[PDB]
Ligand binder design. Structure first.
Ligand SMILES: [Zn+2]
Ligand SMILES: [Zn+2]
Ligand SMILES: [Zn+2]
Ligand SMILES: [Zn+2]
Lengths: 6, 67
């Protein structure tokens, strides 16, 4: 899943 | 300011541009981005909280989750 850092 | 709500003040909570549940900016590597609404959520702020980031492609937050 997509994180804030990405 | 990129964010009109908190004016990018690092000492201010913001549930718009940081964690939508707690307003905190720490641990962006642990903030999940909802694939529908695009808000951020700390894994440890969810109910239930996740001990790690999910490997699954897509993730939907509690507000967008199709029960
Ligand atoms: Zn903000
Ligand atoms: Zn949080
Ligand atoms: Zn959502
Ligand atoms: Zn909300």
């Amino acid at each position: 899943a997509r994180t804030k850092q990405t | 300011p990129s964010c009109k709500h908190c004016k990018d003040d690092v000492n201010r909570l913001c549930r718009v541009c940081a964690c939508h549940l707690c307003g905190g900016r720490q641990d962006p590597d642990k903030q999940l981005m909802c694939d529908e609404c695009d808000m951020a959520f700390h894994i440890y702020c969810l109910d239930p909280p996740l001990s790690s980031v999910p490997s699954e492609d897509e993730w939907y937050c509690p507000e967008c989750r199709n029960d």
